[PDB]
């Protein structure tokens, strides 16, 4: 609505199921939380320090 955009869906629910299937430590680890989603629209990522 402005420069603000937000994500309405997830494309990796299947991966989460697949990981829960093999144990608690898979689903709750850090790698799980790094499953990536595509960027929402024209734009880019940048790092600010």
């Amino acid at each position: 609505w402005q420069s603000y955009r937000t994500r309405l869906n997830t494309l990796f629910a299947r991966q989460l199921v697949a990981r829960a299937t093999t144990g608690i430590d898979t689903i709750l680890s850090m790698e799980t939380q790094n499953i990536q989603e595509p960027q929402l629209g024209k734009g880019f990522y940048a790092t600010f320090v």
Binding site: T22, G23, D25, T26, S29, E31
Partner: protein, 49 residues
């Protein structure tokens, strides 16, 4: 088993694995032998520290 070729992998709590590089598989080989089975015997393995 002294200077034998061995294969192996690491299995992590996250049910995923990495191959052992031979440089390391040789270390476990040297430190843990006498746990390996031979013909006509069966050995009880133990933890590796």
């Amino acid at each position: 088993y002294k200077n034998a070729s061995m294969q192996g992998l690491y299995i992590f709590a996250d049910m995923a694995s990495k191959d052992m590089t031979p440089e390391q598989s040789n270390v476990y080989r040297d430190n843990s032998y006498q746990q390996f089975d031979t013909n006509n015997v069966r050995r009880v393995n133990n933890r590796y520290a």
